[PDB]
Amino acid sequence: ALVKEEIQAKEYLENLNKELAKRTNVETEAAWAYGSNITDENEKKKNEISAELAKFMKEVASDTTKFQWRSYQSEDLKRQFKALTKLGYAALPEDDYAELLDTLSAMESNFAKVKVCDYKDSTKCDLALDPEIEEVISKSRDHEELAYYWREFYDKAGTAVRSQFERYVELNTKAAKLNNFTSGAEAWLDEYEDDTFEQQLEDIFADIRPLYQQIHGYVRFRLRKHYGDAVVSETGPIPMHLLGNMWAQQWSEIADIVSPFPEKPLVDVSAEMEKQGYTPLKMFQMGDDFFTSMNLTKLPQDFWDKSIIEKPTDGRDLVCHASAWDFYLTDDVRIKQCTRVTQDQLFTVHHELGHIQYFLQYQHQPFVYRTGANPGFHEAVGDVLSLSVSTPKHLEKIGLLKDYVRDDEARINQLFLTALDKIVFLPFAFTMDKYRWSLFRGEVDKANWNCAFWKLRDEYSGIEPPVVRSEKDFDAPAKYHISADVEYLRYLVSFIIQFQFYKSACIKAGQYDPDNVELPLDNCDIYGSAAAGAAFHNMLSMGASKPWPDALEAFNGERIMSGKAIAEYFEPLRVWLEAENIKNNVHIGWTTSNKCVS
Template structure:
């Protein structure tokens, strides 16, 4: 073991024992056994937290719907007050011995206040970690590159506004709709134009870079934008991220967890959480491999074997997305039946004179047809449903709960397109969730676990985005093409968005947890090792530890957990199937529509009303009528079974379903620690670890 490694171990051991002692001190602090006082504290907390939440939410709403320096300063002032309130509340809650509180719901509230906070840190370090996260977000938001083939001094691109914001949302089915997530891209350094970049290189991730990755089929251009964006993000954040890891771990240990990953996982209330995740992933991996193999062959037809090896991984820049997490943009290359249409009713919506308001009224009627609640008058008065002409706004679609049981809003720069119609139903599902659990205490006004809100909203969109529903509402009436071919094209579109996303959504936090557990050595090589193992993708060029490619993903540097997207994608299909069964639907799962089903509406209300007052396992047991209390991928696999059968036929002559790795693949990112036997041994271990995945 080298000297540097020994030093690191000593430092880690010292930190562990130091913070273990602090954690024991906090356990001793929980010495107040007066249950009546604890109950009174919770009543006061509910009132004060609701008021604070309203003030912060309103300040952030004013900023993102009217981006000015004044509104930004007001928002930051409220956020600073909220941080102080969080620290004070944590200390009060930590002083009570929750085991002495007989009421289960009250105990649950006390635990929720304590377990997810970093307020156990001393004030200077608490402020430091907040500042580090803010600085990393500033760097990310300010990242700009030059146009392909254009020198910096030739650039003439300009932004419409110096405050033009970037969209940070996942694809519409993974939008961050909780208000605490939506605010995160905005901090003290919300991107302003600066002298060194305002007149020259001005291409940002959204929309310019994302558009190139989605639509360009010039391999050298794709390599250029892929590489350039990473040069403007990761290397500038690496040192800050390393300090963030140290502080996050200290906060977690102070709160009684082994590390920050352990603290993140606590909200899922599952002692075997990591094993459950592995089990779920192994069940969906065969479907992913079939899709991967088919897509690889189509990419070879477009780019050649010089770029994509017939039995190897896929270079990450070819899949239509900055992180290879969503492949729907390459549908033109992989469409099963090019002569049959892909489902897009945008032209019919325009022909019928749809407006943004009509789209939201249609979405509201979807829920009221199931016997659920209409949107309150405050929603229609306060929401921003279309882009205003007179001011700069942030357009990421999001649903907002103002924490006062009255005011709920949506912010969306709606255009008359099918994608925005689906997104509208998605965001209205969040509003319906808020309405259903409105009577819960503030701490319980959320999903049963972090995956639930998105899962519920996406389950509804599975019913909206299918041929049967679009026919029922008079938007699709194409009888001229083979229904089977249309169905396969539709399922391929969904698979490129949902199935292709699963391994990425799985590996992001696997990597993050490994950093919290094992330290910050070789962070970049571990990132690519996991991407190769789970996604089957490799970088298009050599990567080193100086690159820090995880820093190109916003959720990583903004301190937002990601495993909820993996579980949410699986859970949405499980919930969707239960709604379909309640509605009495038969036939292929992807053809089910629960529109106008009161029985499906009752089940959905039962799932939503408890909010976070019950555990996820309790909600799932209710959802499945007692058959299971676990998230299961069986419904997802069933939904895509017709496509999987088709893929198996297409792949029957392939020598390998999945991918194999060789020394060249791993050499693109493996750490170079020297030459000779030691380096060779490290490479062999990496190759063996990659080969293990082939036999899962």
């Protein structure tokens, strides 16, 4: 009978969760070893342990059918059993699962090993993306130099992996269907537990898109003054290599060229960090201080002992894209980051530390619940603090910003600088998954896969490649998360909800009042705020024990993902920008790109 079975099921879950945490520990150590040190031997070891855990999860999913779990009284036990039925890739036949794993590692190791020749010295052929190629893209204003690096990089990180990528789409689809999702798109969307999730994101994106078009128009206008009309046209998509980032996903590296008031301060503290003798270790201690300042949890010793916080000196291959790692024990959490002493890197340290914090906050939950309320909550945590750290308020406290006068013009420069990261990214992130979803769904023929990518980047972001591409190229895997099979919607969701969290944390801190000119949202510093830290503790400590609207509610009492907060933060910029574009007769919008030949 059911009453007795439900008591037995509770003990069954308590043991199984512990066993899964322990088996996942072993798989995570192998994945960490390989990401830290890419070799044939560590590849084998990573993929072999994974295959062994996949076999066990098949057994678990089969054993869940012995329990009448859908008939139980406890919503909590039913939620745990539902989590165990979800096998993902482990639903695949043994041989197909091993093949998918060898595919994933071939792509991610391809990405991690790309090197290109110096533009000025064809003899020097060891420039990696991080840091050598990113340094040119962020700093050079030689448009031909920029196009050279763009093309070398995309050809090596994108095109070289087309056949592996094709086989990955096939096996990802096969797995999704063994789980009875229509495709990998639906499997990814299942993490949000909301069957109107895509529509909700279309609606929010539609509300913020007019602001994006204004920033896009003003930036193109400023780039025409800098490079001239032979390089940038008034009416076409912006050539992406001029935007200071290899994927044009954030434009803040060109702020010194597009800032609304060039004779007024523009915050860039990298040179003061270097002058003060900052190191990667100090930036991480800094991040640690900020979370502890809010009454949140200090980094444990294993973090300091076992983290990799600067790029190795030896000549060994590895993955430099930054990552944060839960080993599913107690306090065994770590970061691997190729720390560089720059303003943007100070934000990236706090982003990674936000994941680590959420690990420490939920580590007492059963293993199935030790993950974010939805993937976007995991990405938002550290960005709430980064939003605070980026303020002239904070940066003056830590001595990194000197002789700053925050008048109306400086305020516009700062809001615009923030927008070049936070608003510009929204169409970018949406397209990373609209592209992969349309491949997963079978909506694009293989003959049209490259131009389908560039057509989305054009339609949504109004950017295009520096040179003509065709179906002979394959550019999408040139983005880390596409080669590494990491879902990207979590970041679009994060960039919307991180404003809901920031606004609420600022109000709780006494740092934001919409009716007080002295407390504007865009200069709020939540450093030292126990009240903001309490709201974080209340939410993060839940892990995935409840549907995410319950976790949002634990933070601020709301249950709805909403673009109200991000619009409120940027509303002074919107008013100023619309007027400035009219004042300057700035053309808005763009004609269809000519850069991808079908």
